[PDB]
């Protein structure tokens, strides 16, 4: 009841899963060397070729 | 398939896939994945009148 941090293992599992999911979602905003990170902008600004 | 016609001299480079122009979108448009060849040659002595 009193002392905390006695259940580190399960907390670590939850934190790892949440962090991995969060960074996977975060990766969308990256550029990867393209013009922009959003498809609609580069679609409406340039012709297909 | 052989498609023949006559064009203005300056629009000859509108005849290519993924191009925009006057004749390119209103008269003759090629598909992006077109395979084949294009032949262009002047006809001043024949298709021009004084």
Q: How far B19 CA sits from the closest chain A CA (Å)?
A: 8
Asked if A34 and A42 count as a contact pair (C-beta separation under 8 A), the reply is: yes
Q: CA torsion, points B24, B30, B31, B36, in degrees to nearest 10?
A: -150
CA nearest neighbour of B20 among A46, A1, A20, A22: A46
Cα B28 to Cα A2, A3, A17, B21, distances in angstroms: 81, 79, 56, 10
Backbone angles phi, psi at A9, to 5 degrees: -65, -50
Q: Distance between CA A39 and CA A19 in Å, rounded?
A: 26
Token pair for A41: 């902008």
This structure was determined by cryo-EM
Q: How far B23 CA sits from the closest chain A CA (Å)?
A: 17
Residue carrying the six token digits 């009841």? A1
**Resolution of the model in angstroms:** 3.3
């Amino acid at each position: 009841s009193s002392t905390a941090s006695a259940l580190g293992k399960l907390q670590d599992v939850v934190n790892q899963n949440a962090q991995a999911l969060n960074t996977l979602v975060k990766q969308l905003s990256s550029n990867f060397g393209a013009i922009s990170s959003v498809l609609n902008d580069i679609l409406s600004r340039l012709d297909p070729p | 398939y052989a498609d023949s016609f006559v064009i203005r001299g300056d629009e000859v480079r509108q005849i290519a896939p993924g191009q925009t122009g006057t004749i390119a979108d209103y008269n003759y448009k090629l598909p992006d994945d077109f395979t084949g060849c294009v032949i262009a040659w002047n006809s001043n002595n024949l298709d021009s009148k004084v």
